[PDB]
Paper text:
Later, one decisive step in nucleolar pre‐60S biogenesis is the release of the [name]‐[name] heterodimer by the AAA‐ATPase Rea1, which triggers the dissociation of interdependent assembly factors, associated with [name]'s N‐terminus (Mitterer et al, 2023). On the other hand, we observed partial or complete removal of the foot structure in particles prior to [name] rotation and in the absence of a tightly bound rixosome indicating that C2 cleavage and trimming can occur to some extent even before the rixosome could interact with the pre‐60S and trigger 5S [name] rotation. This could mean that there is no strict sequential order of these events, but that also branching and parallel maturation pathways are possible in principle. While we cannot interpret the significance of this state at present, it should be mentioned that it was only observed with the Rsa4 E117D‐Nop7 split purification.
Residue numbers in the entry:
A (entry chain CQ): 1 to 113
B (entry chain LB): 148 to 390
C (entry chain LB): 2 to 98
D (entry chain LV): 5 to 139
E (entry chain CN): 1 to 246
F (entry chain Cb): 2 to 102
G (entry chain CO): 2 to 43
H (entry chain CH): 357 to 477, 482 to 509
The structure:
Amino acid sequence: MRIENCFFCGRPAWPSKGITFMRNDGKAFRFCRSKCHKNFKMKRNPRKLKWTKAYRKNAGKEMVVDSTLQFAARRNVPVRYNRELWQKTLKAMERISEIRARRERVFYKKRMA
Amino acid sequence: ELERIKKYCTVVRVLAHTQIRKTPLKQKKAHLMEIQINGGSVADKVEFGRSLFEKPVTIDTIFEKDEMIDVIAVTKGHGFVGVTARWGTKKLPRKTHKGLRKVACIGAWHPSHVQWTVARAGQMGYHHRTSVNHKIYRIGKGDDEANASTETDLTKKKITPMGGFVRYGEVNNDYVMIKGSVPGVKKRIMTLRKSLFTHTSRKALEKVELKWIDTSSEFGHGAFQTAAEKKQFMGTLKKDLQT
Amino acid sequence: SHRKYEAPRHGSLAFLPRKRAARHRGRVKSFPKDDPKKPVHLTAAMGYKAGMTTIVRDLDRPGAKAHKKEVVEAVTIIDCPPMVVVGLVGYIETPRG
Amino acid sequence: KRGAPGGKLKMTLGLPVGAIMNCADNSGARNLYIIAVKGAGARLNRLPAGGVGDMVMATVKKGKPELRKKVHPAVIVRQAKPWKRFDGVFLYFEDNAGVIVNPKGEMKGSAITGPVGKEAAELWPRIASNAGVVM
Amino acid sequence: MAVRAQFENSNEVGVFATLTNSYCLVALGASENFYSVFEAELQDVIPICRTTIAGTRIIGRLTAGNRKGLLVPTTTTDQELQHLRNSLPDDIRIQRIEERLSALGNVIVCNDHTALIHPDLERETEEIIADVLGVEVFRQTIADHVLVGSYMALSNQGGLVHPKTSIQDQDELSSLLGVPLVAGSVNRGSNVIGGGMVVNDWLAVTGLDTTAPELSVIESVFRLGEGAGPGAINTSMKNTIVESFY
Amino acid sequence: GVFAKRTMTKTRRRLRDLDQIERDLRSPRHLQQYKETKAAEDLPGLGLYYCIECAKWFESETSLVGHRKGKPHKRRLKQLKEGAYTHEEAMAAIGYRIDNG
Amino acid sequence: AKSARASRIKENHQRFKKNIAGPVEAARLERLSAKLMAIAQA
Amino acid sequence: IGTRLQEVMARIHVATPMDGTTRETFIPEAVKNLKKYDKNDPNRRVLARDIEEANGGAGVFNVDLRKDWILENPEWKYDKIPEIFDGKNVYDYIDPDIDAKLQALEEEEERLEKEGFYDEDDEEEEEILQKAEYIREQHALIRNEAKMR
Ligand SMILES: [Zn+2]
């Protein structure tokens, strides 16, 4: 399994959470909750709703440029399984999380000086 | 009296009570029941029970993961209910005289009586039910700080959701995870029973491999499994600098 | 005269009367049949229902379409602190039960 | 063999008898009006209903005049009523749509416009072969 | 070396199998008979992978590849991608792609040298095909069908196309591909060639319903078995074909 | 005013989205597919008068030039100028990306 | 269809109980009884 | 020539490339050395269907999908591969050259700590803020008296 993200607001979408809309052009829209789904059906722009990660990025209230944001990607070329690689990846995930947290706090203080 | 049980009796049951003080319940009075000892001879049963006097028995020394059990409980009470929800009858058409959530004919033929087979309004729910063939997915240990962690999800977390179980509290003891639903409601005493017969299905012989357990909040549309995850997603708050 | 269209009966007669239970704790009506060749064991336990949650299960069920796939299933959590054994009741067999 | 396919898990049926759905193939029909559902059981007052991957019997209300006088078998490929798959996903399409087939399941047309459901594509291999998008 | 087979009483072999010159992919079923057909023919010469794509069993019409690479659609899960990567050796490049037309077995048909695609694929998908598969890519329709992968079976030996493909289209497409082409059918007149069969340079598996004349046409065009060539069709087989398909 | 405002949010009353409108504006093949999805003889004005921005058919050239002065058309122009919300913007909002080699 | 009370269904279930589910439940009973005897003798 | 005859001529026609060239084929060498599988031979290869029949038949036999995994170390093929860790996807972070980027991140982090990126920083100001809070409280009390009267 995997953790998806809400199309509308950007929250983590876990299994059995939310609803998916399948459109006839071939695009699928995963929503984490009925709030996001109903706003989407009402044709509201997520970029103008201030509780969404889209608005927060467009307003510059999320840390968008950082070295720690380059480690997570949709890997479309699979890697042959390697136990050592997976354990060093888990250690990397912990260290990246800590460094990202401290840099985010610095970014917030520079916003709120 | 122990010798009398040894020489005259064919069925031996222990008396056992819950430790309700380890639960979040406001109730302080424990629940007591007779539990039958099966297997062995009657003398063996008597030594077994006498050796088990004043001792705590955990759930995993009676039941095991990948086993089907029976759950016996009293169901959710609904009070006095009409025939439409009590029996599932068809609603009469709109603006029917003297009521449409009713049965039109209750006694249209002989005898000159109302028959016991006719749907009538009355008490619905709070019935005793015995439901069978419920698979145990996990017997989690209360002293395990990651008893909701799996082999593919390495997040160290307990079974209790964020904010606790709604109207129950936190599960700090050993717990049983059962596929599906059970007859009772929250806070209610459940009786778990061994199956009376040998099973005939492959589902009873299947081995359960959990990949993930949801621990998001059930007080709303919870999207986070842990408070650390919630902090990591949200970022720094105003009260974080104020503190 | 006869009913023109057949329809099965609403509800089951195996659960009558539809009345409140006479006790709040569920009653074990039957225990498993005792085999003296098996080792000694307890046939029941008690717990308290805490609520429900969701899992993802890796399914090995040969023949099913969801074989070797992940399935999302609802589960019930029952909080089970250990019980304490404090007694012993003996039963004799009589022509009245 | 009757038209009901085997090995189908339970899903929500969004299209009862009397529903008009779109025609997703180039057979010439524009809509399909459902008159019956294959495999529908017997129940007093209950409308037979179909879901994605079911074969129904339908008449053509809009389309070529040669198609208007017959009862065609069709397979529902898209529905708008949300339903759950075994992986826990609740989902729906933006329209209800089906394709005309024969009783053995081969399509009357040659191409499918728009996506098809996984249930329809898995139960009917000809629809799988003529589907450009499977969702 | 043409073998008649069935996947759970279905004659559409190409829907449930993908066969190249370096690996075979078979849909996971409730039995091992469909895998065992390919296992009896390909006696461990190339790997056979039992795989699931997007939770479905239509992997043949959802996947496309050759002896150099494999392309899977965007709805493939990470564990399915990992299973494919662990099952295939490192000589084969596996990529998950973001093409809107996710039925890659319908929109892409390819051999080890060239590939034909549905005319509406994205440009980025076109260079991804040309990079991972290492082939040259052309946008083509076969007998006015845009689903070239389901309406054509292609190998390095030759190709079998839709039975209603005109002579001019056969010559143009044969000049484009560099292989001889024959317009023929499978499964008693089914024109879905790609869904009806899978073929590589030394083996073809067609449905059990496929008759002896069209099976012999397949063997001639794909050069399977001793003394098999496309020249036998219009010389030694012409009477049989005219008698059968008139 | 909106006709039958109670059932406006049903799936059977759904309108074309702004991202599809952007694709129709940038590429005529997408618009041609959307128009082949419809039947020209049942369209207002035989399909000859169509506003791509509003994704809407009109009965006459006078009617189309008429709606262009109205505020619904101008709100559609403003929303297209701002840009529709899409999956790549949604991915950038969380700082996620695609590694294609 | 054969009913749940059919004799052939009962015989099939009896063979399943004797040959398949029986040893599995026997081993599980041995493990559980060993644990609860460990508590009883403790 | 009628349409049906045109169709059968189209079926018998064999198209060929105009240049006369042919594509290189990639039949592996072991194909010639393969022996043909036949059922009557007592020395057959044991097939997957034979193993299934020996282990309960169809619907009972559980196939092992990890048996044919080609891995660097053969005892890794039955490992439980991690997928979720602390609300993140492991497969998103799987990168073959992870150690170089993690070393670069650590070098950047120590550089920033040296430069003072994470370095964190008046009684008169505190008194003036406290007096302002007192004034705001008095204003609230005045407004409450007005709302009462
Ligand atoms: Zn959301």
